[model samples]
Target: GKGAYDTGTYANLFQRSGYREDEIKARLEQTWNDLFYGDEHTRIYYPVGDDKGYMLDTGNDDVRSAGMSYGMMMAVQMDKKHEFDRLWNYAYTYMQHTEGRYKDYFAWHCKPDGTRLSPGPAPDGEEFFAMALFFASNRWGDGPAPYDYQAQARKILHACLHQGEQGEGDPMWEPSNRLIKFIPELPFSDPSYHLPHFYELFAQYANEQDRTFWKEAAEASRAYLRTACHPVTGLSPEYANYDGTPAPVQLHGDFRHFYSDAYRVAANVALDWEWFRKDPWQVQQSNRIQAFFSDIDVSDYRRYTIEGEPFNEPALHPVGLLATNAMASLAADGPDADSFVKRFWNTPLRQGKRRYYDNCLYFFTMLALSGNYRVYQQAAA
Candidate 1:
């Protein structure tokens, strides 16, 4: 099957699963409203003084680069230009570094008042920010400085590739292997941080000089997953090396197992299949992971080894995991695909201390299944 890149028609998985078009639209709008403007426990988006806003990491009680850029992506996909600008304004004014080694990069997290919590940048945030900014530029056209969306995107992409050449900070993607690091300074990568779908778009929309780099990065990621994901279970570790083997123990925790961050791999691979379909392996990978989770109820979600051994500890974001599994229907042609979609459709948005991460995945899954997670292209020159 041709991908959306060529046909310009995204698969509405929910509709194909027997949901009505109006029902899908209504669900999307309701989910957005609940996540952005619903009651305190239900909403993660909060507006700040006049022109700025942030997506709070409610559990950690801080704003993160991942949440901020994710908010921007949500806003652009939903065509909420006002919200998009507010998120970008907050990121630009508070998160991004203007000078020194980390110029053009954003802090990974911050306090609610916009104070930096860390000095370094996360490549995941930078990648999402660039992609969201490009979408904003294409969907709504450019504005002023900082808001000059396309230029802003190019600057971020340029820094991603060329940062350490000036002898200051390291670049996000390793120059030789073309794999994105977990962070600018890290040698390892988060399996979920890979987004070959976004990289494919970046190849077309990033700076002229870096086009080839982004193109190779896309294929590199697609191939990397071949090694990173388990052959039978399709579960990937949270942190992996350039060769796709799970990384060694780290100070942060034993990230060799599948957990929170690894959950996104299913959704990412499925979306890549939806948008590009360049890797047929994605289909089998999605099917394999979905099958692994087929019998486990969301209530029973747990941390596990990539080989599919569940641990005693329960999952921190069960709802998010289910949402992503359902999202895999975009690539999974197996018999149980509809079952996953239906189960996710019946689930409500999460509430309470951990709602932020869960609901972010929830909204993205909803958008993808409803055919609203679109690729906004650069305007014809």
Candidate 2:
């Protein structure tokens, strides 16, 4: 193993001398409740066509894997099993393809009424789904085969790795290198999609034979992050080739810059380091990113070239930027580290048509900072 997990080192600085644990916990709890049942701009959950509930991406006017899986993880962590089940039911009913190449995989996007907007499954969502389901199963237990959390999770992992072996589907990870792709069919990868920490846990919890593959995948992702992130700015492109260079833009606009999807890089690096002090570079990576944005006001955050030059387009998720930068404090030791967290503390959950993504990232940052974003194991080792 390229890394070791020391769950003993729970790094919630708010619980330490300079901060108040009780107050932080209270804020996290309140924030969670607000998002679940807040004003129109802040809340995303809604019952769809009767019994099922879904988390909507309001700005996009649709439901997505990112929001669904994130909502499920948030629910399970908060011990809100009802919300978890509701979100899962909507996800299963609407997004998942029961037959064809995408069999158990979910459509990346859909309408609120459960209409598919796209047939492709995003790798990020699939991995998050697997991880969240595993946690849910461990925290609760299995139900039916498809409704059975553990079995459903394994079904996802199975599709991710072995989908094309018996049919027309494509595997999520590169078969030869084990690096997760931007989409199952794409040859390139998304930097934010590399969740080495989750993959490490999958090694311990996924199928017996696939456990070895996940172990190797964890190492590959850690090594990939080292190369994907910029040396000075710490920025990552939305898409990159297997070799770690920014992938060329196709029909979907320029993804070779530090844009919306790329914003999660720092937060992912911070968590990977927090969960398994596997890479020494993460600390420095966090520092570099915070340093890059140290003086830039949050309102001034913009789309940028990986070399650190700001683009003409303003950031679509400024609060998400603030949250990720603050979350980076978990690994960052630079002067601006605490500043980011303090700024985030003062910031409110985004409210508007585009608030969905920002608020989702905000909650995750809250969970991470409060030490609530954790690994749920099945009983004892």
Candidate 3:
């Protein structure tokens, strides 16, 4: 089957799995409203001043680049330009550094009042921000200065590639491997951070001089995932070495296990297949992982070794993990695929302090499964 990029038709798993079409869209809207504007416990987005807003990491009681970029992406996908602009305004005003080693890079986290909690940038946030900005440019057209979305995106991609040239900060991607780093200064990678599908689009939309680099980065990430993800269980570690082995234990704790950060691998792989269909491995991997979790109830989800050994620790975001697994149905064709999608459709969006991450995944799964997550682009004249 041709992918969405070639055929311009995305799979609506909900409809295929017997969901009413109107209800699917309504569910998508309701999910968005609940997550962005519903009850205090359910809403992650908070408006600030007149023209800006931020997505809170409710568990931490702070703002993170990840949630901000994700909020922009969600808003643009949902065609809520006002919300997208608000998130971008807050991100630019509070998180971006003007003259420093991390110039053009956003602070990884900040206070709701727009105070920086960290000066460093996470590569996942940068990649998502660039993609969301480019989408906004294509969807709504550009505006003045900071609202020149395409230019903002291009500047970000350029900085990600060239930040170290003048003895400033290190590049977000490893120059040798073309793989994105966990953070700008890190040599290791988070398996979930590899977004080959986004890189494929970047190859076309980025600056002309760096197009080849983005193309190589796309291929490198696809290849990297093959090694980073375990062959049998399809689980991947949170952090990995250049060769795809789990990275050594970090000062914070053991990230070599499949934990919170690693849950995104399934969703990323499924999206790549939906957009590009460049790898058959994605399908098998998705099937494998979904099958692995087929018998486990969401309440029983727990930390695990990449090879599938369970740990005593329960998952911090089990609902989010379930959402990603259901998202894998986009690429999965095995027996368990339909069941996962149906299961996710029936699950309500989580609420409470940790609701931020789970509901974000929940929303993306809703969009992707409904065929609403699309590439916003224009054809050349």
Candidate 4:
């Protein structure tokens, strides 16, 4: 099997549409530069000092594990080692907690000045950081300490699976069932956090004793996703229980509906299918989602029920939704697949206060469409 970062021509929806490879590469590289160093309102990554850098959640005026881990992945995929190192340094310095309940986990949010805004860790960031770090280790070879990417990744996953084993804190996933919870303290899981693609890689590359665990995780998540998503609409709740029903509401408002966080579910499943091709259900799932959204204008994207009823609230990340729909084409052979790709092609990188999330999704979609979002190869050391 190829490395997690070493993707091949498994699914090229854009090429099937007859887009030129040269033109696509140019678009992918251009967007990479635009996000990292471009002179625009949409640029999210920023240099903090000579060596450290941060990716701001501009809408929230803080740094987030979600964005930082995402930045690491984008940098490694684009071969920007220097930028990758810079972002990792910032995350390690400020976001990662060295002690206490969230030990070995990153603080979910921090001020741009590197101040901790919250002390708790989020599982999604930890997993993405682990995946990006593994790719970094392979792409640039091992470095020292925090930059010893492979070791650092293993450390994160170690805590992820065994945090409470030695007495303090919660493990990132439900140890019994191998499903990743939305947060460590909670009993429920976020469907979007189910990245079987990364889990498959972790199964082979993570520490020997945990290899079986990660493999089981991949299997569990794939099955859980099938249950979590609606049979016809393909939409999922932002949070759901181990049994795959939308988790009952907690303190943070009802997440049982398909909202912002849930939008990424389609994207994750598409990429999982693209990279692994292990799930036949993903094909129908992707098509179902595309069919559900086909008649809704991009400007009219909104929160919806898993059964596909729109809510009064407008989408906070329309471009992100558009990008995910486009990525779903990787597994979709539906009538709306071509329209999703074309609509995304015409949409520009989002701008203004809420640009952060959408632009990030947009860039990844462009990279995938262009055949440049590769699964990097890490030769056995």
Candidate 5:
């Protein structure tokens, strides 16, 4: 279900589409109760029937950090300094960890009892933490001193790059130690998950060596994803052998199944497709990947199942929304991109009044990039 910050992303989408700022703000305020003050902490708790509740522990950090980051972007764009400052403080004080844990620089996912939740070998969350810092430093100029920020960023980045050394025959990285111990008995391959964002940030603030390191890392990561993952399906499985091969099915649980991560990894594949254009293979691969998502029957999508029957109409997952949005962005630059964008934007998957947080933000950012103002207006309306 769409929560408060999710609605805010929709509002931003509407703003980008040419709706009046007041209209967007009005709609955005409607979600403030949920986004800003809805939850006591960053966790999302849902009832699982039987009078029990299941909490989707984000393990490291959750959408609250993303809300802060996206909110900061909006405030900077709108020049809403006060809101930006408040949101930034909330994320920094509550979600971010400035120290290394278990000998690696990382963030901590804490349970209600204050015990560590999912401790990770994956660095995407931490990467985003650095990204928040970079954004705050560049946009607000109120972050830690120049040297401190850069030092912290470099340390985190270095830790991510060297995550392989943490274990033998590990993939480039593992999302979490439990992932390594269980689930396909393999490591994860999304280590450079934040490399693209890092490249942009480094170019803006890093020294020559740091810039080179980022560029090289990004290139290698792009290559790694293309070669290691199956190019035809564009499906980067949740776990892979050290050599990047998909692990045996016997090792997987139903929820942690390889296909479980298809949407997100596919989204990452689409992003790489857009970022690097020189490789003709990648371009072809991107086309096929786009076709795969476009081919899915929305009516056949499934969320859950019970009593031997599928339940919950299949809607776009958060990562699928991101993938579609990224595809739209890439298509926009080509001859027939607008039609694709219109088709996807008007799809049933996004027609409802509510929007998921990640998806909505992804859509807003994509629309903002494309200079599509009408779409935003329609979303708000």
Candidate 6:
């Protein structure tokens, strides 16, 4: 009973973190074990649970897409043609669209038999699916796979912008209003849910007219984040009313945790990348984001607590990895770049937690991305 999800993500992490050839080969074997020998239900339990998870059979598209994206990344990094073929086949078999019940789009979740599991209209999940397909097509070169890839990608982007239930006035749209309005919910009214990656997927796959929709969505995301992401705290609310007001109270207890933070970090990465390439405001915003990270003690990578006690938290490892990577990316592009990541590598808080997956992956990714393994190793020594 291989855990497909863990192997997929860990493979990507290894690829991005510059794992050696032997390491990559070894991990690929582990990935194979996880996929085949690991538990079938347990394989999909990274973001959610084994048996009765939130995204299970629900129309949450990201889980499947993220799974596929990680798989695709593994395929690319490993040069494993069979793995790619198998994973792609699995995605097509389980996640592709036949009927237009989702309006020419794939359903968010489905049973192994391909029965629709969740409710109407999920855009975030769809966007990730489109992104995975787009990456697959782009990396593999143009063929029927790419065409199908582009088609599905375009379908999701178009639905979110034009036909889907969006917020009023602005280009900001909620994938579904009815199912997502609950307080303290994960996929509530955050427009940041679909930006940059969704937009980037569209830009990669869309035609001229369809491409502008992505541009609009990207710009709209910038506008939305400007107002929605709290300026001082950098904490974006998990839930908001239709009018963009924050929910009266947090609905779910898990709302404040790493899952939501991952979304925010991903959104910021997309926007910052685009801003570097096209817009001036994005450059400024990226700088502000970098400054925010610089102000924080990277060594103090702990949950925000009034009492400073450790709590049982999910995705802490992933969130820390992402946050450190975000900081490292900024440092690479900033003035005190060398010293920035070096200090983080040498810092006691970061060094003490090297064994922790979150800290280790975070540092590993930063070290690989920066190509400063000598300094990293020296610091460890």
Model 6, 209-297: lDDT tens digits are 76755656555555555555444434344444444445454633534332333334433443244223433344344344444445545
Each model's lDDT: 0.92, 0.87, 0.93, 0.87, 0.40, 0.41
Clashing pairs in 4: 5-375, 5-376, 6-375, 6-376, 7-375
RMSD in angstroms, candidate 6? Answer: 11.0
lDDT of 3 at 381: 20
Query: What would the per-residue lDDT of candidate 3 be over residues 1-381, giving only the tens digit for each residue?
Result: 778988889999999999999999999999989888998878999988889999999999999999999999999999999999999999999998898899899999999999898898888999999999999998888999789999999999999999999676899999999999988876889999999999989998999999999999999999999999999999999999989999999987999998889998999999999999999999999999999999999999999999899998899999999999999999999999999999999899998888889998999999999999898877552
Clashes of 2: 0
After superposition, the stretches of candidate 1 with alpha carbons farther than 4 Å from their true spots are 379-381
Estimated TM-score for each candidate: 0.98, 0.96, 0.99, 0.96, 0.57, 0.56
Tell me the spans in candidate 3 whose CA falls farther than 4 Å from its real position.
none
Model 5, range 1-381, lDDT digits (tens) per residue? 231212332223333345566654544443333333344442233322332222223332333333334454444444445555554444344444444332433223433332344444334445554554555445445444332444555555555445446553222234332111221123444322424423544544555544655655555555555654455544444444435454454432433222334444444443443433333454554455445445445445443211113345453354444434345344133333343444444442222223344333443334343432111111222
lDDT of 1 by residue, 322-356 (tens): 99999999999988799999999999999899989
Better of 3 and 4 by TM-score: 3
Ten contiguous residues with the weakest lDDT in model 1 = 372-381
What does the lDDT read for residue 272 in candidate 2?
87
Which prediction has the highest lDDT against the true structure?
3
| Pairs with backbone N, CA or C atoms under 3 Å apart (clashes), candidate 5 | 13-376, 14-376, 16-373, 17-373, 17-374, 17-376, 18-373
Regarding TM-score, does 2 or 5 come out ahead? 2
Candidate scoring better on TM-score of 4 and 6: 4
Model 3 — TM-score against the truth? 0.99
